[PDB]
Design a protein around this ligand. Sequence first.
Ligand SMILES: Nc1nc2c(ncn2[C@@H]2O[C@H](COP(=O)(O)OP(=O)(O)OP(=O)(O)O)[C@@H](O)[C@H]2O)c(=O)[nH]1
Ligand SMILES: Nc1ncnc2c1ncn2[C@@H]1O[C@H](COP(=O)(O)OP(=O)(O)CP(=O)(O)O)[C@@H](O)[C@H]1O
Ligand SMILES: Nc1nc2c(ncn2[C@@H]2O[C@H](COP(=O)(O)OP(=O)(O)O)[C@@H](O)[C@H]2O)c(=O)[nH]1
Ligand SMILES: [Ca+2]
Ligand SMILES: [Ca+2]
Ligand SMILES: [Ca+2]
Ligand SMILES: [Mg+2]
Ligand SMILES: [Mg+2]
Ligand SMILES: [Mg+2]
Lengths: 345, 438, 54, 423
Amino acid sequence: MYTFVVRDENSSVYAEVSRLLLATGQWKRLRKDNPRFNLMLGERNRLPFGRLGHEPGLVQLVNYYRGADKLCRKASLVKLIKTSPELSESCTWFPESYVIYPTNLTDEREVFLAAYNRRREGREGNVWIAKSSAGAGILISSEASELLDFIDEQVHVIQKYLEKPLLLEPGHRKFDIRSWVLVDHLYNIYLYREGVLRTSSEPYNSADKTCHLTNHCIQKEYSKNYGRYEEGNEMFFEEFNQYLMDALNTTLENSILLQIKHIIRSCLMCIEPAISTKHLHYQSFQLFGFDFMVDEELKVWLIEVNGAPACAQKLYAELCQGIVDVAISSVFPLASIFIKLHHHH
Amino acid sequence: MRECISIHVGQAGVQIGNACWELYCLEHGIQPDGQMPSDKTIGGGDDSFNTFFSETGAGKHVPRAVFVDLEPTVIDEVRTGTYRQLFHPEQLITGKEDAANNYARGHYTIGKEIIDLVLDRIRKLADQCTGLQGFLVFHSFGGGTGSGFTSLLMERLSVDYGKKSKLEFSIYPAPQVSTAVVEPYNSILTTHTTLEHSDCAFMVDNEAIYDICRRNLDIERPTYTNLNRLISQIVSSITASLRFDGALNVDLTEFQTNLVPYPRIHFPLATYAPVISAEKAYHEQLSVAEITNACFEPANQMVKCDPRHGKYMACCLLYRGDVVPKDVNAAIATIKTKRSIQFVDWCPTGFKVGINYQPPTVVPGGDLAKVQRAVCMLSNTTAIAEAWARLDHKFDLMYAKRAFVHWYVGEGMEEGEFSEAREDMAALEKDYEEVGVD
Amino acid sequence: MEVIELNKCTSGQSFEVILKPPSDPSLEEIQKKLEAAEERRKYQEAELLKHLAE
Amino acid sequence: MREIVHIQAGQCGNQIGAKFWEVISDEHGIDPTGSYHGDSDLQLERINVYYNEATGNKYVPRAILVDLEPGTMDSVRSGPFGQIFRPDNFVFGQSGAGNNWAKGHYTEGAELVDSVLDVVRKESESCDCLQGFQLTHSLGGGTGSGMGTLLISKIREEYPDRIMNTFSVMPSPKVSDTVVEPYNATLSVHQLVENTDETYCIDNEALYDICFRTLKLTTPTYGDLNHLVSATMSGVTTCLRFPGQLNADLRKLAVNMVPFPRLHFFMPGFAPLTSQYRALTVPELTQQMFDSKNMMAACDPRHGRYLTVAAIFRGRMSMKEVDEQMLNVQNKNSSYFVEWIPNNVKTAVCDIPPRGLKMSATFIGNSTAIQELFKRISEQFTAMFRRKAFLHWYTGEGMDEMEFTEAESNMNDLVSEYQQYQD
Ligand SMILES: Nc1nc2c(ncn2[C@@H]2O[C@H](COP(=O)(O)OP(=O)(O)OP(=O)(O)O)[C@@H](O)[C@H]2O)c(=O)[nH]1
Ligand SMILES: Nc1ncnc2c1ncn2[C@@H]1O[C@H](COP(=O)(O)OP(=O)(O)CP(=O)(O)O)[C@@H](O)[C@H]1O
Ligand SMILES: Nc1nc2c(ncn2[C@@H]2O[C@H](COP(=O)(O)OP(=O)(O)O)[C@@H](O)[C@H]2O)c(=O)[nH]1
Ligand SMILES: [Ca+2]
Ligand SMILES: [Ca+2]
Ligand SMILES: [Ca+2]
Ligand SMILES: [Mg+2]
Ligand SMILES: [Mg+2]
Ligand SMILES: [Mg+2]
């Protein structure tokens, strides 16, 4: 009879995991402040990692990797890619990005302007985007003056805006690919076989942020074609793969999925020495949400990594069961839907 | 040559002290009767080992140590132990009824009645010193005497020896061997009143020592004897520079200079390697790189915590045995390319290295196997604050209900001292977070 | 990686390696606290004896 | 040399006290003549805690026998180990107490208490470092209950800085002698709330059920009930009588067991309880030790929460497996241990097992479920007091109805205090 505690009532993913654990009849839930637990579904902010692994006779497992925020923060991700030799500033699958602290507060203002002028002089597309972790507040402009003035009005980052995205037909619309990745206590990297494309219901216009931001909340609030093409502006891999074969004469695995798996491994292997719990007094696993962008050349670009992601309604049951199977039951056995990305530890 | 006086308070302090001086004698070739054949200066001398041992006209090398306990049962072991001939009776001070795991009882009630006697006995040893550096104080956090009387003694020492340095070896409480539920109370109370009086304190979590004994020594249920044997090895590695010829950490002042840039943050993390079981007849001797790499494994630290999620302010490598500087630098370079070692911006990213050619000494018949080379790393990491957070959380749980508080108030202590000590720990935790977190 | 302050003797040697440059209460007050606490004990015990006398 | 002074008062107190000394005397190798004939130095390591040493290498129990009638103490002197007690330590009157708390506390008992304190003073004066006192008595009678609590009050006045510990037998209508037992017990409980640091609550209802339901004794006698108490008292005092690290003295035990001064009433438990040669594994001891059927207070532990717990394992066994099983109990039933007292369960192990057993376990629990015991006594008290029934036995000794009203309120407060910490 294993025990666990719930410290994040707003987690829809682990609310199902907690429900599944109870349904097994072998997991007993405890008060959120009871220390004699085997598993902790910890809170998002200020998770007391320092108090884990100090209970004699209790194998303790938590659903978050301490130090993973470096990968799940806008500014942190940019700094990690540039400063990490495994990724290097010459990274080809990550858009050119710069960290810009507001003037009312190192910083990369002068470095950003140096590359901006090169594009303006070189006649190249000089459209950038500004964003931060304190958003639902994103500004897309071709003038660097508006981007810098907007930040001054929270640390923000500016990266190159992909002006040539792969547009789905019919519709001539934008989209993004969400991939769920589970890393267990052994640091095996499991990629959920099922992905989702959060597509924009409005035609892409390169000359209004409704057709540029593929967020599910913006498409269901400011878009007038929500659910026209696919239910909830969510196209799954089965349909997307069929489209790639009919339109571009290729498969999702070859044109896109190979680059996605390559990007997932590079990011997770880079921080492995810093967050691995191999020889630690407590063990960690975590579910990640990778968001990618595809251009017209079928090149995959990494946009953001979410450490506390949600899941598609139709995929909650399958994914949450996989979490219990490979992540929880592997440490606490009771009485595949993932693709293992093998690597060197 | 400048003398150091060792002070052992309470059961934990006394028993750990007994194991250390046993190891010192083996290391310096001092026999149980106090004779030292290698010492050719009979009755005197200013050698490195004389910082811990005085010499009589008859050639006896008497440790510069004082043993104090509010109950006589533990110190009576030393009076009839193997090394009973080392200490003269004036060095062993015992009461009749102990502090009953009550800080207030050890600090106010019983401590007030024996404090003057302890100081007078310490004064006797101080008068034998041409130039006293300071004191080394051994005690537990959780015991009533170790916590309550130690804090009273540290205050008086600051008054009577204002210019002398004071270092601590403190036993952090662990339930697997704990003897009282109020040990979180006593830990915070003693840390609050001792913080401004200690220049450098080496905390040893019994949990870490307990698990190292079970994992590396194959001891199913480690006892205090098993724990103290291992603790004495770490203590010996820390004090070896004071007892042998060398150029690193040659005096107590250098410990603060090299390990403590900020006074309040004076709790360095100790990591030791290798710990090999004596039952293993033949064990593959570890290299310099391997034992150096093990210094960055939480499983070998005296306090379980993750330095990867903190920042370093200083770091010393204390090697014993077959170790040359060339091999140390090669191991350090490799570790930098595979480990997460973040220093604070206002400090250089480097290591102070000390090498003593004599390999570690092991007590005959003990549980530790003889090794050709060993290392103890002393790093001032903010990650050690995890031990404060754990301790403070348990304090908060009990104090919110005032559980057991009446025992302390009944001894004359005011309830306000609880919240005062807790607020000081809250500030201490805040300082660590400001230094190690962005 | 720079090695500095190399000191060698018969029993060992020490040195430093740099990998990157940087970027009390008086005796009077003590006795007052001890006596203050002892006085509170006397007050508490006197009240108990008063209670037992009733 | 931390000595304990033992006091046994009244019929129940002296009959159980005598059996206790018979049991521990056998464990320490002391014969009825006071001579030691053991075979292990662990028996004499802490022998002075309960025994004085006289001329000729004789060990004399540091026990004082008190009663307002000579009957029971005459049987003790003429019974097993009767000659081992110090003759001058028999302090008795002739009138009796008629199962009347007022007689023991105010009239008959007051006439005799000074001579008892003289013997206590003589025993304490020859102590190197007196820990405190342990009193064995019942609460339902007159001498143990009334004069027992009077002794405690006067001992505390003369030795205020000493620990006061009692083994108190709680009355039950199942095993009852008089209808006034709830009166005597209620009056005594308030005395204990104020003047003791540790009270082991022994409920005669539980002892009878164990003898009948568990031990298969169709017609249990007081002698059978006292067998359980003897074995329980030996277990709870193990940490005091043998070399150990946890709860080795009365004060440290109180510090570990009593988070609040008034909540110092403990539920004792013993295991095994067999009707007999089969070996009992460490997991089996642990389960039985925490089983309500092995408790002595007749209180369901699942009806409350454990503030603190002291466990003692006796015999040659795997201390590793002991720690594992204890951690399994806490981790599999953590809801029954308060979370605001971290690591409130302490475990001790002793190599010397009790007679006739290779392995045994003793349970000492401070549970809020003990309020059920005080509620039960309060209901029986009120059922009679609402009609002032049988009060004349007490008003005839000078007591007033107001004193009964205050005792009723005091125990209802004690019940309320337990209820706030159970939530
Ligand atoms: N490592 C180690 N820890 C010990 C030893 N003895 C006691 N402890 C720890 O110290 C704490 C209890 O403090 P003690 O030193 O035993 O108590 P004390 O200092 O004698 O003070 P009193 O309450 O008066 O007995 C517990 O957490 C024990 O685990 C020992 O020999 N070695
Ligand atoms: N460099 C870039 N080039 C093109 N489009 C971009 C872009 N950066 C962001 N976007 C667009 O903006 C949308 C939202 O950006 P981002 O993913 O940073 O927001 P968010 O983090 O609030 C949503 P989520 O957490 O679901 O990823 C993306 O889904 C994408 O459509
Ligand atoms: N367990 C046990 N209980 C007893 C014994 N004798 C009496 N009692 C209980 O004690 C109460 C009577 O008190 P008693 O000791 O006889 O009165 P006293 O002599 O005036 O103190 C009743 O509740 C009895 O059930 C005994 O030998 N063993
Ligand atoms: Ca000499
Ligand atoms: Ca000072
Ligand atoms: Ca008379
Ligand atoms: Mg995101
Ligand atoms: Mg002690
Ligand atoms: Mg009777």
